From a paper:
An understudied class of proteins in phosphotyrosine signaling, the receptor protein tyrosine phosphatases (RPTPs), are a family of single-pass transmembrane proteins whose architecture include an extracellular domain resembling those of cell adhesion molecules (CAMs) and intracellular single or tandem tyrosine phosphatase domains. In vertebrates, this diversity is typified by the leukocyte common antigen related (Lar) and its two homologs RPTPδ/PTPRD and RPTPσ/PTPRS, which form the type IIa family of RPTPs. The ectodomains of Lar-RPTPs resemble immunoglobulin (Ig)-superfamily CAMs and include three Ig-like domains followed by four to nine fibronectin type III (FN) repeats. Surprisingly, we uncovered a tripeptide, Lys-Gly-Asp (KGD), in the Dlar FN5 domain that is similar to the RGD motif in FN10 and is conserved in the Lar-RPTP homologs across species.
Author numbering: 707 to 734, 738 to 809
Write the structure that this text describes.
C-alpha cells in the first residue's frame, strides 16, 4: 500500500545456519524508512512457528544476513518496505533450504 514490493529479491546461502538476502529499491508512495525481512520455517511446504522479523532500518538498505537458522531446514523469506504511509507490498516468497 505504501509502496510496491522490493524488486529482484535474491537469497545466497552462506552456510548451514545462514543466508544472505538482498534486493533492489521498490519502483518509485510513502517515503521509505527501512525494510522488514520476514522468514518462517516451512514443513512440507506449510509455515510452522512464529515468523521471525528482522528489521533493516536504513532507507538505503539493500541487504542483510539471516543467521541462527537450523541446518537442513526450509525457510520462506519475504521483504517489504516500511514507509511514511504504512507498509509496502511484500515480495513474493523466496524459499530456500539450508545445507547440512
Ligand atoms: O520440504 C523440506 C522439509 O519440510 C524440511 O526441510 C523442514 O524444513 C525440516 O525438516 C525442518 O525440521
Amino acid at each position: 500500500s505504501g509502496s510496491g514490493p522490493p524488486r529482484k529479491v535474491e537469497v545466497e546461502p552462506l552456510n548451514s545456519t545462514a543466508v544472505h538476502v538482498s534486493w533492489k529499491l521498490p519502483v518509485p508512495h510513502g517515503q521509505i524508512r527501512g525494510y522488514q525481512v520476514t522468514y518462517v520455517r516451512l514443513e512440507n511446504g506449510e509455515p510452522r512457528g512464529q515468523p521471525i522479523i528482522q528489521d533493516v532500518m536504513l532507507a538505503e538498505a539493500q541487504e542483510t544476513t539471516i543467521s541462527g537458522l537450523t541446518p537442513e531446514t526450509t525457510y520462506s523469506i519475504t521483504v517489504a518496505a516500511y514507509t511514511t504511509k504504512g507498509d509496502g507490498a511484500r515480495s513474493k516468497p523466496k524459499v530456500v533450504t539450508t545445507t547440512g
